Each structure stands twice: as structure tokens, then as C-alpha cells.
């Protein structure tokens, strides 16, 4: 069996991240770390044979056979590192080519917002000017969006977009409802939003 | 350098006339393994710690009083086939 | 001690592969169909069909890579035709316990390279082509990781199984047969007394010429000789003056006698 | 490398299906895994070479076929809701030389439902930048909203002046349940595209939000009033405003 820290992990950009698996079977000798991005397949990230460390760039894979403890370290974590990390292990040959997978750890690396400017905007449907959406955008990474306690009001998680050409990142969340009383001012009331959030 | 086969002929049981027996031939100590030896079966080709090869040859027979078979061997070190009796 | 090895004999272009438990062969490789041949039912031991196929497969590829990967480098290496490469690999047991493992390659009947730790090491004797041969092998380490796994984890698990599997074959006791004879005359007035111990198993044995209790030095032990039934044969000789002879006897000690030794008096 | 077909599929309970994995990498070993959200990979079946196959950790309800070296087929004998999962094919050499590790397909998202009437295509609407945002940040955010679709099988992309775009884009990694109180709840998904305010205020510029939906095949039987919820693209568009 392979027990892996369930997470999830949310770290700030620049942080050292430590990912770990524990196993019970001493026959394990081959140790694989896979990285899996959202809605895509596992990709081999690091592989090590038996006890020891292997350093590849910002990554160090580490295997401690006597403690039955393996670790993936990521230095200077970039937002691009946000993914699921799965560890896998094979026993000594003949091993049937088989490997056992930990259930993965999902890592989110919060990007540093250089110049924050939290605000909540209203957006109107390009077709029927009646439908309406609320956009909370340009807040800091330490800011957290909360789910709506109103089940007729939907609110999405924060998401990071990258205007690559302008060296610019931005957090944002969307809130919407086709309930009539709904208005942008009260959309994110269940969220601890900044005091200086711009409300037009 | 090369090594010359050591040849040892002998029998499985004490040789009594008219009793079924076995005739072994132990060819050892030679190198390289290109070697020929004299319906007979032999053993797979193995080698000792000093890297020299060895083989065993055998045949069921009956040791008579007018017969005395032999072990003929030729090697890349031998200028002439060496014949050993019993 | 107890040692299972797999040997390779390369000739230049035939190729031979066998697997031996000490002096006793237990595995044969079929040239034609690429298949491990069990010579005993318990030739297979702990492993299972699943695994065996997996290993057999691993042996096919690796041998090929090593074989073609020589006339590929035969010229670069000094190696001039004709020549023979010998490889022995395996592990041993010292009284029921894993007493280490080995893997040694030989060029022309003299040591060439050894596998130590996690890589290949030249024998200092074999000179500066041996040192080059390692530089080649050690170039890909993943190759060395696999070699290492087989020597230090596969093989030990295996031999233990085997041992247990054929405990009915080995561990068995076959009582020896003992008789006396003249040898070639060592000179006038003298004799060679010859003690014969044949068909005994296991291999360790004790044979000595005796004057009562007076263990006669000069007793001369011969080669332990094999037969196809796995038993052993052994001659112990003594040169004496003719008169000295009748006083003498032959004592044979073997595990199967359980304390009751064989004693043969010259008269 | 390693390819899987199909990429999405919907099944009525009891129906059958074959998944096909192919690799042109000359690999001896091939594998079928399933992965349930949050969890890792569990091996269903695997094959060590042409013509032979073996059971993994969770083989029940599935069968496999290693027809050539290249192909490894996975078959669902009789679909059950429990088999709703993502399936990954993998291959690797027998005795690799540059270390262990396997290559993976991009996955097959399969959903098993009790009724085909539970399938819906998305509705798509594009929402135009706030005048406030533009005047305050000198930037302009568009938002796309795909709503009321089931199952969770969509692919969303932005198209500006007829070219697909990636910079300035952010789509939700997972969809919301419109009615979390249901198991067969329909889904909602959102996405942002941010561009400079001067690029939005141009009436020559065309912004289109596209959602690829994967639903029923033509072979699936359909007896309901509403249009057959087949695989389709639903788009929404907007032009620049000065
Ligand atoms: C086959 O056997 C090896 C060793 O054989 C066993 O050794 C004893 C544990 C005993 O049970 C004997 O009957 C067997 O012959 C096994 O290696 C050991 O495995 C056990 C559990 O299987 C484990 O606790 C030990 O630590 C292992 N020790 C080793 C590796 O030396 C092994 O399990 C078997 N493996 C195969 C597939 O051959
Ligand atoms: C043909 C008999 C197969 C032997 C069965 C047991 C397998 C494990 C035993 C030890 C194997 C050690 C040999 C190492 C192989 C190295 C390959 C090579 O370089 O030639």
C-alpha cells in the first residue's frame, strides 16, 4: 500500500513545496513521481532507483528505504507547478512491469499579485441585455472566495489568467443567478472581501 | 596462453566381469573450449574458478576380460590425439 | 559453500547459457526457441510461470544486446579473432544465509571485469583495455541498476526457494561403497595402497590410511570425480614398503554412515 | 505517442463499449487504468506482449484484447453507474534503458446513466465588459457561461478574429452543479478572456466563445420531444463597442 498526503496544498509563489509518500511493502525498489495537469494525463516527472536523491532543476526526488518515506521537493515554486502529483512504486524484478499509485496530492501555487485592485463589476448579456453576471476581479492571492450559502446563487472558484504580452496576472471569480433580487453588491457577501473593493 | 585437457578414465562400480557398469571420462582443466572426445552421451559444458572448462562423458557397458576401452581426446593444444585407458 | 550461478560461454559465433546450483546443473537455455529449460521439476523453485516467462524474456533481450554489442565493439576493443568470453553470475549461502553475490567476466581464460557495488570494475591485471571496457559498460547507469537488482534481490530470493523446493533431492544421503587395490609400483620393494570410495552424496568426505589410530600422513587425496547420477568418487593412496602393508587399514567417514565408519584392513 | 479513442462517451446502463489504445512506440507493455476524482490510478488489466493479457487490481466488469503489438482494447461487458470514471491507457518498453516510468494517454471520460433523457447540450452566453472596469483598469474582461448541460463532457475555447486564443484566458477547471441536491444534476461552466480596453472598443474585432459538447451518437435511440442531445458546438459572440 502507498499512503500519500491527501492535501490539497495551497502555497504562495516562491515557496518550497514538499510532497510525500509512505509505503508498507519493503520490496519496493523503483520510485516514480508523476505530474498530472487538470483534464490531462499523468506525465513522468522524476524517477529514482532505490535509496537516494536525484536533483533535476528545481526538483529533488528523495527516497528513504529504512523509513519507507519518499519525497518530492519543489524549489521556488512557480504557478505553472499547479497540478496533481502522483507517486508510484514497483517491487524488485521480476515485477511484472506493474506499479502501485498513491492517490495523489493536488497542489495550487498562488501567484504574487504585484498591484492589486479589487472590484466587483456587472456584465450584461451581449444578446438579451437582461441576463446579468457579476465579476469579482483583480484581488490579491491571500484573498479567498467563499461558496454561496444561497443555493440559487452560483459562485465559481478563483482562477488565474495571464495576459502574457503585458506581463500581467489577475485573479477572478464569477457569480450569477436568474433570481431577480440578485445584485452585484450582495453577490460575494459570504466572502471576506477587502474593504477597498471598488463597487461601481 | 592455452591449457591442456587433463584426462581421467574410470568406472562407476568396481569392475567385475559380466556385471553391468558405467564408464566415465573426466576431461578437465583445458582452454579454450573447442574440444572433441571419444553411442555416447556427455554433460553440459561448465568451467572452474580458474576459468578452465570441464566435461564428463559416460556409457553403460559390461567390463569383460579381453576388452579395455579408451578415451581419445584432441585439442588446439594437442599435436596428436591423447588416448587414455583403464 | 552453497552457490547458484549462471554461466555464459561466448565463442567467435556460438553462445551457451546454463544455470547451476554448485556442481549440479538445474537450468539449460534452448538455442532454437529461446526458452529456459528446467532439468528438475523443482528446477523452478519459488517463482511462478508468470515470473519465469518475464525473466526468460529479460534474459533474451539482455543477452542479445550484450552479444551484438561485442562484434559491434570487437574492433574498437583490442579483442582479436578468435576469442572467448566467459561470464559467471549469482549468489551464495553460508549456512542458510545470504553470504553475498558476484558477477565476473573473463577474456581468454583470465579475469577481465567484475561487477562491484553498482558498477563495473577492471581487474588491475587485465590492463588498459579492461579499464576501457568498463568505461563503456558504466556509460548507461540504468543498465547497471538492473544488473544490480538481479544480483542482490532477485537471485537471493530465488536460491532460497530452489533450496526449499528440492530439499528431497539435495539434503539426501547416499551411502558410499569402499574397496582396496594396488596402484602402480613406486619402485622395487614398495607398493601403492589404493582406497576406493565411490558413489557417495553429499560431496564432503573423509578418507585416511591408518595404522590402528595412527593417522598416516602421506595419505594422498585425489580429485573428487563426478558421475551422471550426481554421486562422487574418490581415491586415497599411500606408498609403503611391502612389509609395512598388512599393519594398515583404510578409514572412511561420511555423513550417511552416522558415526559407524567404514574400515577396510589390507588383509 | 499513446492515443485513446474515443475521448468521451455516454452509456445507458447495461450497454456495451470498446475503448481502443494504440501506440507506435514499439512498446511491449500496455495498461488500462481507471481514475476516479481525487484518487489515483487503479490498474484494470494489462498485457506483457502480443496475444497475452492479465488482471490488474480492479478487473471485474472489464475485459481486454491485445490484438497487435500496437493495439490494446478495453471492453465494458455491461455498463453500470459505478463505471463512470476516466480511463487511461499506458505503455512502456519491457526493459527500458533510460529509466522506468510509463507513457500515458490523455484519457477517456466515460459517464454511465440510467436514462438517456438526462442528457442536455449547453446553452452559451457571452457577457460584455463593464464600462466601469474599462474606465478603471484600462482593461476589458469578457465572461462566457455554459449552462444546463449533462454530462460533464465539454471543451471550451475562445476565438478572436477567427483564431483560437490562449493568452488572457481562464476557464474553470471543474464545473458547478446547478442543483447539487441531485445526483444527475446538470452543470455550469465559466471562462474569462481579458484584453486591453483599446482592443475591445474596436468594432472590427470579433469575440466568440465556443463550447464543444460530447453527447449522444447517431446510433443512440431518441424518442423525446426536444431535439436529440447529440455531440455539437454551441457558440456565442460579441463585437467591439466604442
Ligand atoms: C520466494 O522466497 C523468498 C525467500 O523464500 C522464503 O523465505 C522465507 C521467508 C520462508 O517463508 C521460505 O518458505 C521461503 O522460501 C521470499 O523472500 C522473502 O519473502 C518474505 C515474504 O514472502 C519476506 O518477509 C522476506 O523478508 C523476504 N526475504 C527475502 C527477499 O530474502 C519471497 O517472498 C519469495 N519471492 C519470490 C517471488 O520468489
Ligand atoms: C537461465 C537460468 C535463469 C536463472 C534464474 C534465476 C535468476 C536470478 C539469478 C541471478 C542472475 C544473475 C545474472 C545477471 C544477468 C546479467 C546479464 C548480463 O550482463 O549478461
PDB file of C-alpha atoms in Angstrom, chain D residues 18-232:
ATOM      1  CA  UNK D  18     -14.939  -0.897 -26.581  1.00  0.00           C
ATOM      2  CA  UNK D  19     -12.091   1.577 -25.968  1.00  0.00           C
ATOM      3  CA  UNK D  20      -9.059   1.371 -28.192  1.00  0.00           C
ATOM      4  CA  UNK D  21      -5.493   2.288 -27.288  1.00  0.00           C
ATOM      5  CA  UNK D  22      -2.725   2.445 -29.821  1.00  0.00           C
ATOM      6  CA  UNK D  23       0.991   3.304 -29.619  1.00  0.00           C
ATOM      7  CA  UNK D  24       3.568   3.458 -32.429  1.00  0.00           C
ATOM      8  CA  UNK D  25       6.455   3.385 -29.979  1.00  0.00           C
ATOM      9  CA  UNK D  26       7.118  -0.327 -30.223  1.00  0.00           C
ATOM     10  CA  UNK D  27       6.308  -0.952 -26.556  1.00  0.00           C
ATOM     11  CA  UNK D  28       5.915  -4.458 -25.180  1.00  0.00           C
ATOM     12  CA  UNK D  29       3.948  -3.488 -22.009  1.00  0.00           C
ATOM     13  CA  UNK D  30       0.444  -1.878 -22.151  1.00  0.00           C
ATOM     14  CA  UNK D  31      -2.022  -0.931 -19.394  1.00  0.00           C
ATOM     15  CA  UNK D  32      -5.620   0.163 -18.793  1.00  0.00           C
ATOM     16  CA  UNK D  33      -6.233   2.303 -15.685  1.00  0.00           C
ATOM     17  CA  UNK D  34      -9.293   3.996 -14.309  1.00  0.00           C
ATOM     18  CA  UNK D  35      -9.072   7.153 -12.213  1.00  0.00           C
ATOM     19  CA  UNK D  36     -11.879   8.456 -10.042  1.00  0.00           C
ATOM     20  CA  UNK D  37     -11.687  12.134  -8.996  1.00  0.00           C
ATOM     21  CA  UNK D  38      -9.413  12.832  -6.057  1.00  0.00           C
ATOM     22  CA  UNK D  39      -7.971   9.300  -6.268  1.00  0.00           C
ATOM     23  CA  UNK D  40      -5.054   7.928  -8.237  1.00  0.00           C
ATOM     24  CA  UNK D  41      -4.788   5.253 -10.899  1.00  0.00           C
ATOM     25  CA  UNK D  42      -6.083   1.725 -10.360  1.00  0.00           C
ATOM     26  CA  UNK D  43      -4.972  -0.899 -12.925  1.00  0.00           C
ATOM     27  CA  UNK D  44      -7.822  -2.792 -14.622  1.00  0.00           C
ATOM     28  CA  UNK D  45      -5.935  -5.102 -16.995  1.00  0.00           C
ATOM     29  CA  UNK D  46      -2.514  -5.163 -18.616  1.00  0.00           C
ATOM     30  CA  UNK D  47      -0.543  -7.029 -21.298  1.00  0.00           C
ATOM     31  CA  UNK D  48       3.130  -8.030 -21.426  1.00  0.00           C
ATOM     32  CA  UNK D  49       3.088  -8.605 -25.179  1.00  0.00           C
ATOM     33  CA  UNK D  50       1.064  -9.564 -28.218  1.00  0.00           C
ATOM     34  CA  UNK D  51      -1.714 -12.043 -27.535  1.00  0.00           C
ATOM     35  CA  UNK D  52      -1.385 -12.307 -23.790  1.00  0.00           C
ATOM     36  CA  UNK D  53      -3.251 -10.277 -21.119  1.00  0.00           C
ATOM     37  CA  UNK D  54      -3.569 -10.270 -17.313  1.00  0.00           C
ATOM     38  CA  UNK D  55      -5.760  -8.969 -14.497  1.00  0.00           C
ATOM     39  CA  UNK D  56      -4.932  -5.838 -12.527  1.00  0.00           C
ATOM     40  CA  UNK D  57      -6.262  -4.644  -9.196  1.00  0.00           C
ATOM     41  CA  UNK D  58      -9.818  -3.891 -10.313  1.00  0.00           C
ATOM     42  CA  UNK D  59     -10.520  -6.199 -13.318  1.00  0.00           C
ATOM     43  CA  UNK D  60     -14.189  -7.030 -12.706  1.00  0.00           C
ATOM     44  CA  UNK D  61     -16.686  -5.921 -15.355  1.00  0.00           C
ATOM     45  CA  UNK D  62     -13.979  -5.282 -17.910  1.00  0.00           C
ATOM     46  CA  UNK D  63     -12.171  -7.391 -20.493  1.00  0.00           C
ATOM     47  CA  UNK D  64      -9.177  -6.741 -22.750  1.00  0.00           C
ATOM     48  CA  UNK D  65      -7.712  -7.810 -26.034  1.00  0.00           C
ATOM     49  CA  UNK D  66      -4.107  -7.335 -27.137  1.00  0.00           C
ATOM     50  CA  UNK D  67      -4.628  -7.707 -30.860  1.00  0.00           C
ATOM     51  CA  UNK D  68      -1.396  -6.401 -32.332  1.00  0.00           C
ATOM     52  CA  UNK D  69       1.651  -5.040 -30.552  1.00  0.00           C
ATOM     53  CA  UNK D  70       0.237  -1.567 -31.249  1.00  0.00           C
ATOM     54  CA  UNK D  71      -3.334  -2.004 -30.008  1.00  0.00           C
ATOM     55  CA  UNK D  72      -4.822  -2.747 -26.625  1.00  0.00           C
ATOM     56  CA  UNK D  73      -8.649  -2.831 -26.475  1.00  0.00           C
ATOM     57  CA  UNK D  74     -10.757  -2.354 -23.328  1.00  0.00           C
ATOM     58  CA  UNK D  75     -14.291  -3.597 -23.194  1.00  0.00           C
ATOM     59  CA  UNK D  76     -17.227  -2.895 -20.959  1.00  0.00           C
ATOM     60  CA  UNK D  77     -19.327  -6.003 -20.804  1.00  0.00           C
ATOM     61  CA  UNK D  78     -22.387  -4.301 -19.291  1.00  0.00           C
ATOM     62  CA  UNK D  79     -22.238  -0.641 -18.265  1.00  0.00           C
ATOM     63  CA  UNK D  80     -23.015   0.199 -14.648  1.00  0.00           C
ATOM     64  CA  UNK D  81     -23.135   3.622 -12.957  1.00  0.00           C
ATOM     65  CA  UNK D  82     -20.080   2.585 -10.938  1.00  0.00           C
ATOM     66  CA  UNK D  83     -18.027   2.509 -14.154  1.00  0.00           C
ATOM     67  CA  UNK D  84     -18.447   6.269 -14.625  1.00  0.00           C
ATOM     68  CA  UNK D  85     -14.792   7.315 -14.485  1.00  0.00           C
ATOM     69  CA  UNK D  86     -11.799   8.452 -16.501  1.00  0.00           C
ATOM     70  CA  UNK D  87      -9.839   5.725 -18.255  1.00  0.00           C
ATOM     71  CA  UNK D  88      -6.113   5.884 -19.072  1.00  0.00           C
ATOM     72  CA  UNK D  89      -4.130   3.730 -21.405  1.00  0.00           C
ATOM     73  CA  UNK D  90      -0.405   3.456 -20.846  1.00  0.00           C
ATOM     74  CA  UNK D  91       2.530   1.723 -22.427  1.00  0.00           C
ATOM     75  CA  UNK D  92       6.210   1.256 -21.778  1.00  0.00           C
ATOM     76  CA  UNK D  93       9.166  -0.825 -23.021  1.00  0.00           C
ATOM     77  CA  UNK D  94       9.789  -4.214 -21.382  1.00  0.00           C
ATOM     78  CA  UNK D  95      13.320  -3.385 -20.377  1.00  0.00           C
ATOM     79  CA  UNK D  96      13.637   0.401 -20.833  1.00  0.00           C
ATOM     80  CA  UNK D  97      17.162   1.793 -20.905  1.00  0.00           C
ATOM     81  CA  UNK D  98      16.623   5.373 -19.838  1.00  0.00           C
ATOM     82  CA  UNK D  99      14.850   4.505 -16.594  1.00  0.00           C
ATOM     83  CA  UNK D 100      11.415   3.325 -15.510  1.00  0.00           C
ATOM     84  CA  UNK D 101       8.144   5.211 -15.899  1.00  0.00           C
ATOM     85  CA  UNK D 102       5.274   4.725 -18.364  1.00  0.00           C
ATOM     86  CA  UNK D 103       3.744   6.911 -21.119  1.00  0.00           C
ATOM     87  CA  UNK D 104       0.080   7.913 -20.720  1.00  0.00           C
ATOM     88  CA  UNK D 105      -2.841   8.695 -22.989  1.00  0.00           C
ATOM     89  CA  UNK D 106      -4.848  11.851 -22.469  1.00  0.00           C
ATOM     90  CA  UNK D 107      -7.761   9.866 -21.130  1.00  0.00           C
ATOM     91  CA  UNK D 108     -11.289   8.788 -21.830  1.00  0.00           C
ATOM     92  CA  UNK D 109     -14.105  10.364 -19.914  1.00  0.00           C
ATOM     93  CA  UNK D 110     -16.994   7.913 -19.670  1.00  0.00           C
ATOM     94  CA  UNK D 111     -20.329   8.515 -17.950  1.00  0.00           C
ATOM     95  CA  UNK D 112     -22.965   5.823 -17.333  1.00  0.00           C
ATOM     96  CA  UNK D 113     -26.595   6.971 -16.921  1.00  0.00           C
ATOM     97  CA  UNK D 114     -29.854   5.164 -16.165  1.00  0.00           C
ATOM     98  CA  UNK D 115     -31.758   7.199 -18.738  1.00  0.00           C
ATOM     99  CA  UNK D 116     -30.656   8.837 -21.964  1.00  0.00           C
ATOM    100  CA  UNK D 117     -33.248  11.564 -21.340  1.00  0.00           C
ATOM    101  CA  UNK D 118     -30.856  13.067 -18.794  1.00  0.00           C
ATOM    102  CA  UNK D 119     -28.530  14.358 -21.488  1.00  0.00           C
ATOM    103  CA  UNK D 120     -28.529  18.076 -22.348  1.00  0.00           C
ATOM    104  CA  UNK D 121     -26.358  20.344 -24.510  1.00  0.00           C
ATOM    105  CA  UNK D 122     -25.023  23.556 -23.091  1.00  0.00           C
ATOM    106  CA  UNK D 123     -26.570  26.961 -23.516  1.00  0.00           C
ATOM    107  CA  UNK D 124     -23.937  29.593 -24.186  1.00  0.00           C
ATOM    108  CA  UNK D 125     -23.947  33.322 -23.468  1.00  0.00           C
ATOM    109  CA  UNK D 126     -21.154  35.884 -23.702  1.00  0.00           C
ATOM    110  CA  UNK D 127     -21.169  38.845 -21.360  1.00  0.00           C
ATOM    111  CA  UNK D 128     -19.671  42.184 -22.378  1.00  0.00           C
ATOM    112  CA  UNK D 129     -17.046  44.132 -20.364  1.00  0.00           C
ATOM    113  CA  UNK D 130     -18.269  46.525 -17.689  1.00  0.00           C
ATOM    114  CA  UNK D 131     -17.930  50.211 -18.566  1.00  0.00           C
ATOM    115  CA  UNK D 132     -16.642  50.589 -15.004  1.00  0.00           C
ATOM    116  CA  UNK D 133     -13.836  48.048 -15.448  1.00  0.00           C
ATOM    117  CA  UNK D 134     -12.652  49.642 -18.676  1.00  0.00           C
ATOM    118  CA  UNK D 135     -12.611  53.147 -17.226  1.00  0.00           C
ATOM    119  CA  UNK D 136     -10.873  51.999 -14.037  1.00  0.00           C
ATOM    120  CA  UNK D 137      -8.339  49.413 -15.174  1.00  0.00           C
ATOM    121  CA  UNK D 138      -7.942  50.217 -18.869  1.00  0.00           C
ATOM    122  CA  UNK D 139      -8.641  46.517 -19.416  1.00  0.00           C
ATOM    123  CA  UNK D 140     -11.802  44.686 -20.559  1.00  0.00           C
ATOM    124  CA  UNK D 141     -12.952  41.276 -19.328  1.00  0.00           C
ATOM    125  CA  UNK D 142     -15.338  39.059 -21.265  1.00  0.00           C
ATOM    126  CA  UNK D 143     -17.114  36.203 -19.487  1.00  0.00           C
ATOM    127  CA  UNK D 144     -18.544  33.052 -21.022  1.00  0.00           C
ATOM    128  CA  UNK D 145     -21.232  30.959 -19.396  1.00  0.00           C
ATOM    129  CA  UNK D 146     -22.110  27.417 -20.445  1.00  0.00           C
ATOM    130  CA  UNK D 147     -25.201  26.208 -18.604  1.00  0.00           C
ATOM    131  CA  UNK D 148     -27.556  23.279 -18.174  1.00  0.00           C
ATOM    132  CA  UNK D 149     -25.552  20.575 -19.874  1.00  0.00           C
ATOM    133  CA  UNK D 150     -25.180  16.932 -18.885  1.00  0.00           C
ATOM    134  CA  UNK D 151     -22.979  15.073 -18.744  1.00  0.00           C
ATOM    135  CA  UNK D 152     -19.785  16.840 -17.744  1.00  0.00           C
ATOM    136  CA  UNK D 153     -18.247  16.453 -21.198  1.00  0.00           C
ATOM    137  CA  UNK D 154     -17.321  19.853 -22.603  1.00  0.00           C
ATOM    138  CA  UNK D 155     -14.381  21.661 -24.157  1.00  0.00           C
ATOM    139  CA  UNK D 156     -14.419  25.461 -24.039  1.00  0.00           C
ATOM    140  CA  UNK D 157     -12.311  27.820 -26.164  1.00  0.00           C
ATOM    141  CA  UNK D 158     -12.130  31.469 -27.170  1.00  0.00           C
ATOM    142  CA  UNK D 159     -11.942  32.684 -30.746  1.00  0.00           C
ATOM    143  CA  UNK D 160     -10.787  36.187 -31.587  1.00  0.00           C
ATOM    144  CA  UNK D 161     -10.962  37.340 -35.196  1.00  0.00           C
ATOM    145  CA  UNK D 162     -11.348  33.671 -36.152  1.00  0.00           C
ATOM    146  CA  UNK D 163      -8.196  32.395 -34.448  1.00  0.00           C
ATOM    147  CA  UNK D 164      -8.230  30.340 -31.241  1.00  0.00           C
ATOM    148  CA  UNK D 165      -6.667  32.232 -28.326  1.00  0.00           C
ATOM    149  CA  UNK D 166      -4.992  31.164 -25.092  1.00  0.00           C
ATOM    150  CA  UNK D 167      -3.364  34.276 -23.635  1.00  0.00           C
ATOM    151  CA  UNK D 168      -5.701  36.249 -21.385  1.00  0.00           C
ATOM    152  CA  UNK D 169      -7.847  33.154 -20.934  1.00  0.00           C
ATOM    153  CA  UNK D 170      -9.014  31.393 -17.792  1.00  0.00           C
ATOM    154  CA  UNK D 171     -11.632  28.636 -17.682  1.00  0.00           C
ATOM    155  CA  UNK D 172     -12.985  26.878 -14.561  1.00  0.00           C
ATOM    156  CA  UNK D 173     -11.137  23.552 -14.079  1.00  0.00           C
ATOM    157  CA  UNK D 174     -14.336  21.912 -12.800  1.00  0.00           C
ATOM    158  CA  UNK D 175     -17.999  22.710 -13.408  1.00  0.00           C
ATOM    159  CA  UNK D 176     -20.651  23.655 -10.830  1.00  0.00           C
ATOM    160  CA  UNK D 177     -23.729  21.578 -10.199  1.00  0.00           C
ATOM    161  CA  UNK D 178     -26.808  23.691 -10.966  1.00  0.00           C
ATOM    162  CA  UNK D 179     -28.700  21.540  -8.479  1.00  0.00           C
ATOM    163  CA  UNK D 180     -26.204  19.991  -6.057  1.00  0.00           C
ATOM    164  CA  UNK D 181     -29.144  18.238  -4.384  1.00  0.00           C
ATOM    165  CA  UNK D 182     -29.334  15.791  -7.313  1.00  0.00           C
ATOM    166  CA  UNK D 183     -27.055  13.003  -8.486  1.00  0.00           C
ATOM    167  CA  UNK D 184     -27.990  13.581 -12.124  1.00  0.00           C
ATOM    168  CA  UNK D 185     -27.593  17.352 -11.776  1.00  0.00           C
ATOM    169  CA  UNK D 186     -26.863  19.453 -14.839  1.00  0.00           C
ATOM    170  CA  UNK D 187     -23.726  21.581 -14.944  1.00  0.00           C
ATOM    171  CA  UNK D 188     -22.487  25.120 -15.390  1.00  0.00           C
ATOM    172  CA  UNK D 189     -19.070  26.311 -16.518  1.00  0.00           C
ATOM    173  CA  UNK D 190     -17.499  29.758 -16.885  1.00  0.00           C
ATOM    174  CA  UNK D 191     -14.480  31.309 -18.587  1.00  0.00           C
ATOM    175  CA  UNK D 192     -12.786  34.710 -18.835  1.00  0.00           C
ATOM    176  CA  UNK D 193     -10.905  36.416 -21.600  1.00  0.00           C
ATOM    177  CA  UNK D 194      -9.158  39.629 -20.765  1.00  0.00           C
ATOM    178  CA  UNK D 195      -7.850  42.047 -23.405  1.00  0.00           C
ATOM    179  CA  UNK D 196      -6.765  45.687 -23.386  1.00  0.00           C
ATOM    180  CA  UNK D 197      -9.607  48.229 -23.421  1.00  0.00           C
ATOM    181  CA  UNK D 198      -8.410  49.680 -26.701  1.00  0.00           C
ATOM    182  CA  UNK D 199      -8.665  46.226 -28.312  1.00  0.00           C
ATOM    183  CA  UNK D 200     -12.256  45.817 -27.130  1.00  0.00           C
ATOM    184  CA  UNK D 201     -13.543  49.276 -28.100  1.00  0.00           C
ATOM    185  CA  UNK D 202     -12.831  48.460 -31.781  1.00  0.00           C
ATOM    186  CA  UNK D 203     -15.994  47.415 -33.683  1.00  0.00           C
ATOM    187  CA  UNK D 204     -13.854  45.489 -36.196  1.00  0.00           C
ATOM    188  CA  UNK D 205     -12.883  42.945 -33.521  1.00  0.00           C
ATOM    189  CA  UNK D 206     -14.945  39.768 -33.139  1.00  0.00           C
ATOM    190  CA  UNK D 207     -15.031  37.719 -29.917  1.00  0.00           C
ATOM    191  CA  UNK D 208     -16.578  34.247 -29.931  1.00  0.00           C
ATOM    192  CA  UNK D 209     -16.880  31.775 -27.073  1.00  0.00           C
ATOM    193  CA  UNK D 210     -17.120  28.166 -28.261  1.00  0.00           C
ATOM    194  CA  UNK D 211     -18.256  25.115 -26.306  1.00  0.00           C
ATOM    195  CA  UNK D 212     -17.775  21.642 -27.765  1.00  0.00           C
ATOM    196  CA  UNK D 213     -20.320  19.244 -26.274  1.00  0.00           C
ATOM    197  CA  UNK D 214     -19.991  15.419 -26.389  1.00  0.00           C
ATOM    198  CA  UNK D 215     -23.315  13.642 -26.034  1.00  0.00           C
ATOM    199  CA  UNK D 216     -25.332  11.014 -27.855  1.00  0.00           C
ATOM    200  CA  UNK D 217     -24.231   9.350 -31.099  1.00  0.00           C
ATOM    201  CA  UNK D 218     -26.487   8.988 -34.124  1.00  0.00           C
ATOM    202  CA  UNK D 219     -26.908   5.331 -33.234  1.00  0.00           C
ATOM    203  CA  UNK D 220     -28.457   6.128 -29.881  1.00  0.00           C
ATOM    204  CA  UNK D 221     -32.248   5.882 -29.891  1.00  0.00           C
ATOM    205  CA  UNK D 222     -34.232   9.065 -29.182  1.00  0.00           C
ATOM    206  CA  UNK D 223     -37.988   9.274 -28.572  1.00  0.00           C
ATOM    207  CA  UNK D 224     -38.384  12.587 -26.700  1.00  0.00           C
ATOM    208  CA  UNK D 225     -39.945  15.896 -27.750  1.00  0.00           C
ATOM    209  CA  UNK D 226     -36.817  18.056 -27.540  1.00  0.00           C
ATOM    210  CA  UNK D 227     -34.022  17.712 -30.117  1.00  0.00           C
ATOM    211  CA  UNK D 228     -31.668  14.750 -29.782  1.00  0.00           C
ATOM    212  CA  UNK D 229     -28.844  15.892 -27.465  1.00  0.00           C
ATOM    213  CA  UNK D 230     -26.091  14.969 -29.892  1.00  0.00           C
ATOM    214  CA  UNK D 231     -22.438  15.947 -29.972  1.00  0.00           C
ATOM    215  CA  UNK D 232     -22.335  19.553 -31.054  1.00  0.00           C
TER     216      UNK D 232
END
